[PDB]
Amino acid sequence: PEWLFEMNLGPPKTLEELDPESREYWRRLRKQNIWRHNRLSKNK
Amino acid sequence: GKKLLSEKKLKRYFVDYRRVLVCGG
Amino acid sequence: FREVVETTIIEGRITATPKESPNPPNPSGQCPICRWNLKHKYNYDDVLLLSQFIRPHGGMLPRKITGLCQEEHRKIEECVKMAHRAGLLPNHRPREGVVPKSKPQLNRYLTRWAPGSVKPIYKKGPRWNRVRMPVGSPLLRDNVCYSRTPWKLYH
Amino acid sequence: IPGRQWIGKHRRPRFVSLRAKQNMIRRLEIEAENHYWLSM
Amino acid sequence: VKQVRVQFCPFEKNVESTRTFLQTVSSEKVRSTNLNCSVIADVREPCVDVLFGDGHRLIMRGAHLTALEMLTAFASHIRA
Amino acid sequence: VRREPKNLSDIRGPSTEATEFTEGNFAILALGGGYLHWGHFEMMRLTINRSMDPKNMFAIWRVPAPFKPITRKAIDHYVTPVKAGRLVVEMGGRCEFEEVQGFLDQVAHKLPFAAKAVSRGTLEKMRKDQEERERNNQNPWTFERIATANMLGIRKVLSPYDLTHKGKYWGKFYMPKRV
Amino acid sequence: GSKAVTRHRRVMHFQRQKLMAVTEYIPPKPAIHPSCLPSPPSPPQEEIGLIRLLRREIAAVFQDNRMIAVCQNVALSAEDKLLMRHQLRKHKILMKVFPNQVLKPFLEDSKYQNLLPLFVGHNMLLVSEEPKVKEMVRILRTVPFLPLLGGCIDDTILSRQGFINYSK
Amino acid sequence: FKNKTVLKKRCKDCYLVKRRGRWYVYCKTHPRHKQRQM
Amino acid sequence: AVASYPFTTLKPHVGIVHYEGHLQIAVADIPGIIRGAHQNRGLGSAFLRHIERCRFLLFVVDLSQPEPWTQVDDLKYELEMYEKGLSARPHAIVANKIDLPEAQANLSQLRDHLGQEVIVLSALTGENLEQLLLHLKVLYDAYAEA
Amino acid sequence: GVIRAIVRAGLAMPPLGPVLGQRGVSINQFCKEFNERTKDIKEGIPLPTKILVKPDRTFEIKIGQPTVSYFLKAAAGIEKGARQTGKEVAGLVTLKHVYEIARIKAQDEAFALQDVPLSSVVRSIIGSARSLGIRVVK
RNA sequence: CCAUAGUAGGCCUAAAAGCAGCCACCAAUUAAGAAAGCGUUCAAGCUCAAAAAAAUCCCAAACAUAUA
Ligand SMILES: [Mg+2]
Ligand SMILES: [Zn+2]
């Protein structure tokens, strides 16, 4: 299970690093959306 | 006229210790 | 329209739903007003036009249902308020068991504000800064006028 | 108005009537012709 | 308050009023409280029968009814 | 060490300096002319620093430190003259307009002259609409034509500066609605 | 007299004020208002990766899984959801749920077209590779309130009344 | 009721109305949130 | 406020006890104390400030615990940690929750260790409450006068 | 009702007393149930569990697998977690053995790891592990 | 438009389980934040994703609609 063993470690991939059309790219996008939405919510 | 039922954490209201800087007129 | 009646058996019936006149004068008019070439051509007086846009009890129908132009929708509700206050809608009174007490009658028209809502003008200002009493609506500014003198909205 | 109604820091405001605008347009379009005839 | 039975036909013409009424009454928050009451859905114009213990049969045709109108009428009958 | 006679001419007229976006998307555009005190700057630094983290977003002082003296019955303090159009404070980084506008316009509210927090896009937008409005006009008569031609003998009433001012400036005040 | 620059708005000479009145901006108004006129059709939309990805999965789940069993989302509690999920995991049948609005476009132009009336409101799909219809109906009988709207088994479209007799 | 020139929200429960020709803010959870236009 | 979960009654609670001679004796209830408490473990010993003014102490001990005799030892140790004279200050030891059979079982060893002087009580059933009231009054008349 | 017990396998039920007894419970029954699954499993391990309690006074204990958090430092020979909670190296856990233990974790539907990619499981574990100030080598 | 869960994220605490504080903020599915605001001792339960005030008594009367 060499290929299965092969896995990314350390930092998660940013939008710049990441290739779009990826499933988890859109997960990250919505994460970021709700993050900055929550960040602006505190002010009001 | 009725007294409001109190929460267990009423230490929020009740204070036993306070540092006060008093200044005269 | 849908009606609900109690006998128990309750159900909805499409009893009677009216339809729009077959030949619109200006097709491609997005508004129902813009369609019939009425844009700046009615005020509070024109109750027949306004009767088509209101619920039986006197309240007004929403934009999505009535299909109204956004800018136009504000005009009708303003005209209808004035229409009510003038007393041109006696069959669209508010909905009971209790009887309303005898109240003074004062004939009014072109009434901008709710009549229990305006504080009396005790001290009016100087000539150069006088406090004036509103008449009619600003939304009705752009209506067709047949006189040189524009609509005086403040008295 | 404390002092004179026309002069000083504080004074009773004036406003341009529709007639006073109309009058001024009449004068401006007269000198518009004047410009033309002194052009050639 | 005793029994409720609902008939709706997705095979035939589809009306969502009774259909939406299902998930309103299939909630735990209502089912746990009304443990005495029993709910059954049937799939084959839609029919709602409420069999009260008070000797009342609430019969409702959910064709020309509003989603929430269904609930309001039911509420008025059960609460009394 | 020199005292200056109060030359109010500095506040008059459009800003020709620091009217360019520099390594920043968001800035506060001055809509009027006034003198900034040190107190203003104190508030500026405090509010901006406490609002957004400097690691992700950066703020730039686009206005010089106060140096115009004020004489009071002898010189007491220093002020900064600003004409209408100067970007007072620049802001840049990986950020959005919607989330910055809030504190930015709030900070601009306290300013002695009228001002607006604007992006690059929004600033350029309003420049475009103004210059569209002037060619779009349905009035034959502009202040420009009359003033320059000396049409009604209007120069008797007008100032020499008015010809340059296009009638858009009146004292320390800038009128954007004026064409 | 006063200075040319003031802290307050200076009062103008009347002549100058008359000038300001005359040289005001006039906006052009068209004979026919542009908002009331029919709009040009909107420029064609850009297909987002979201709907493209979703496109792939729904196409895949329909093509690969021979049977699709449509049942109304009954909003069952997590406590009661687990047992159903575990029962189906033992029977190697998995659950699929999608928004109705994004489900519509496919069902417009596919092998399955007649399920568009079925797919109104909240709905989930029982998908497998084996036609264990008996197991599906068996676990359905457990909860009376929960209905089955039908769907298709072995690429043949049918409702509940057909599915019950097919189970044998 | 607190007199405020500009009216704000302090809650989700908090709601605006126009009564007697002025804006008000009413609040059932926290009646301290009440505001009156001046 | 009374509940099964520990660390209740955070605020000190005063109730007075009426008597026939038109005199009132005030009794204070403070939150639970723990062995240590000098390292601010638990709720600490901050609430102990009231007890300085209190003329005498009520050592309330639960019999649910296997060794209730060690309870008073821990209490006297922690009071000493706060203030030296508090340990030497006069008191009464009161046992609670005796309606439970395990308390009745451990009662014998309580008599062995603590002695007869300790008064045994139930709060829920109000068992032997009267002896408490006698003891409260007697301690008052002893060293709360002059 | 949902009830969670995070107690070592070789340990009995007093704090759980009020927590579970707020609805009135035979605590002895729960203790017996918990201690029954201690003997068959390897000794010296905590057993975080997810018990279910129905209103008809019935127990539905789900033993499943202990928390991943423990399993990060379990085979290391240390019994203390990350105080710093990141930005540090406290666990010198070998990546090879980390892979091995990650593989031997996902065998239960209690954790609801129904994903056929074991690679997806391990990267989720890495996401868990980054919370702790640990490191993986070789 | 909306569901579960690695997970009471961990540490400090007598317990802080999303919400005492601090650090990390990744990550399963296809389908929301190691949670933006409520609520619990802790849990459980909820939601969200456009200004003006003073002193004898307000101060023309009035009016929106007949073609410069
Ligand atoms: Mg939201
Ligand atoms: Zn509120």
Short mmCIF file of C-alpha atoms in Angstrom, two decimals, chain I residues 1-140:
data_model
loop_
_atom_site.label_atom_id
_atom_site.label_comp_id
_atom_site.label_asym_id
_atom_site.label_seq_id
_atom_site.Cartn_x
_atom_site.Cartn_y
_atom_site.Cartn_z
CA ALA I 1 -30.15 26.67 46.23
CA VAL I 2 -29.66 22.95 46.92
CA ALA I 3 -28.60 20.34 44.35
CA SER I 4 -26.83 16.99 43.98
CA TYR I 5 -24.03 18.37 41.77
CA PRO I 6 -21.05 19.70 43.83
CA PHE I 7 -19.86 23.32 44.25
CA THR I 8 -23.28 24.94 44.63
CA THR I 9 -24.19 27.96 46.84
CA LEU I 10 -21.23 30.06 45.62
CA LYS I 11 -22.65 33.15 47.37
CA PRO I 12 -22.72 33.02 51.23
CA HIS I 13 -26.26 32.49 52.55
CA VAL I 14 -27.54 33.85 55.86
CA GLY I 15 -30.64 32.50 57.56
CA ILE I 16 -31.64 33.31 61.12
CA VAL I 17 -33.17 30.96 63.70
CA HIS I 18 -36.06 32.17 65.87
CA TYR I 19 -36.34 31.45 69.61
CA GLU I 20 -38.88 31.92 72.43
CA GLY I 21 -36.98 34.78 74.12
CA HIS I 22 -37.44 37.03 71.04
CA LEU I 23 -33.76 36.57 70.14
CA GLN I 24 -32.33 35.65 66.73
CA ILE I 25 -29.17 33.67 65.90
CA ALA I 26 -27.75 34.02 62.37
CA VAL I 27 -26.24 31.00 60.60
CA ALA I 28 -24.17 31.32 57.43
CA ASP I 29 -23.75 28.87 54.55
CA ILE I 30 -20.61 29.07 52.38
CA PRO I 31 -19.55 26.96 49.33
CA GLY I 32 -17.78 23.62 49.80
CA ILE I 33 -14.14 23.49 50.90
CA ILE I 34 -11.48 20.95 49.84
CA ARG I 35 -8.22 19.67 51.36
CA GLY I 36 -5.45 21.96 50.18
CA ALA I 37 -7.35 25.13 49.16
CA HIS I 38 -4.14 27.04 49.97
CA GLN I 39 -3.08 26.58 46.33
CA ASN I 40 -6.47 27.96 45.17
CA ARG I 41 -7.64 24.43 44.29
CA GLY I 42 -11.42 24.06 44.01
CA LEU I 43 -13.24 27.28 44.92
CA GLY I 44 -10.31 28.27 47.16
CA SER I 45 -10.63 29.68 50.68
CA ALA I 46 -11.69 33.19 49.62
CA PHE I 47 -15.22 32.73 51.01
CA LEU I 48 -13.76 31.97 54.46
CA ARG I 49 -13.68 35.74 55.13
CA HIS I 50 -17.21 35.66 56.61
CA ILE I 51 -16.23 33.10 59.25
CA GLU I 52 -13.82 35.56 60.92
CA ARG I 53 -16.88 37.49 62.18
CA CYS I 54 -18.78 34.28 63.07
CA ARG I 55 -18.57 33.48 66.80
CA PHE I 56 -18.51 29.70 66.30
CA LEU I 57 -18.48 27.06 63.55
CA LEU I 58 -20.67 24.15 62.41
CA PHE I 59 -18.58 21.25 61.10
CA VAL I 60 -21.02 19.58 58.68
CA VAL I 61 -19.79 16.10 57.77
CA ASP I 62 -21.41 13.61 55.38
CA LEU I 63 -21.42 9.93 56.39
CA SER I 64 -21.58 8.77 52.75
CA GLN I 65 -17.76 8.93 52.61
CA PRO I 66 -15.97 5.80 54.02
CA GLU I 67 -13.89 7.75 56.57
CA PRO I 68 -15.93 10.79 57.82
CA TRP I 69 -13.62 11.19 60.85
CA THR I 70 -10.81 12.36 58.55
CA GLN I 71 -13.14 15.12 57.25
CA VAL I 72 -12.83 17.29 60.38
CA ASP I 73 -9.04 16.76 60.33
CA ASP I 74 -8.88 18.18 56.78
CA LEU I 75 -11.21 21.04 57.77
CA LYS I 76 -9.14 22.06 60.81
CA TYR I 77 -5.93 21.88 58.74
CA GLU I 78 -7.28 24.21 56.03
CA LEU I 79 -8.71 26.69 58.57
CA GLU I 80 -5.25 26.86 60.18
CA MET I 81 -3.83 27.56 56.69
CA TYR I 82 -6.17 30.56 56.40
CA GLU I 83 -5.89 31.80 60.01
CA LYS I 84 -4.24 30.22 63.07
CA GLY I 85 -6.96 30.96 65.64
CA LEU I 86 -9.75 29.45 63.50
CA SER I 87 -8.60 25.91 64.36
CA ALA I 88 -8.57 26.78 68.08
CA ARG I 89 -11.92 28.60 67.75
CA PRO I 90 -14.86 26.77 69.49
CA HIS I 91 -17.25 24.71 67.36
CA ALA I 92 -19.80 21.90 67.05
CA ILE I 93 -19.51 18.83 64.81
CA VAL I 94 -22.69 17.75 63.01
CA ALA I 95 -23.24 14.62 60.89
CA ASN I 96 -25.77 14.56 58.05
CA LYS I 97 -27.67 12.13 55.78
CA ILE I 98 -28.25 9.42 58.42
CA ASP I 99 -31.42 8.17 56.71
CA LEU I 100 -29.12 6.15 54.43
CA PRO I 101 -28.26 2.66 55.85
CA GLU I 102 -24.51 3.05 55.13
CA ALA I 103 -24.46 6.07 57.47
CA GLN I 104 -26.11 3.93 60.17
CA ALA I 105 -23.42 1.27 59.58
CA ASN I 106 -20.56 3.78 59.91
CA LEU I 107 -22.19 5.48 62.95
CA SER I 108 -20.56 2.96 65.31
CA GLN I 109 -17.03 3.89 64.18
CA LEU I 110 -17.96 7.60 64.33
CA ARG I 111 -18.87 7.01 68.00
CA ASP I 112 -15.49 5.26 68.36
CA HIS I 113 -13.44 8.09 66.81
CA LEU I 114 -15.33 11.37 67.27
CA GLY I 115 -17.26 10.44 70.43
CA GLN I 116 -20.74 10.97 71.92
CA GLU I 117 -20.45 14.79 71.89
CA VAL I 118 -20.99 14.84 68.10
CA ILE I 119 -24.64 15.35 67.20
CA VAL I 120 -26.09 13.15 64.43
CA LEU I 121 -28.76 14.59 62.11
CA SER I 122 -30.76 14.19 58.92
CA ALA I 123 -31.67 17.25 56.82
CA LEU I 124 -34.09 15.61 54.37
CA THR I 125 -36.18 13.90 57.07
CA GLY I 126 -35.31 16.48 59.75
CA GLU I 127 -34.05 13.87 62.24
CA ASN I 128 -32.72 15.12 65.60
CA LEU I 129 -32.95 18.76 64.47
CA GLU I 130 -34.05 19.80 67.98
CA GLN I 131 -30.74 18.74 69.57
CA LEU I 132 -28.96 20.97 67.04
CA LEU I 133 -31.13 23.92 68.14
CA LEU I 134 -30.39 23.19 71.82
CA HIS I 135 -26.66 23.07 71.05
CA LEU I 136 -26.84 26.28 68.97
CA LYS I 137 -28.54 28.14 71.83
CA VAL I 138 -26.17 26.72 74.48
CA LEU I 139 -23.03 27.72 72.55
CA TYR I 140 -24.50 31.21 72.09
#
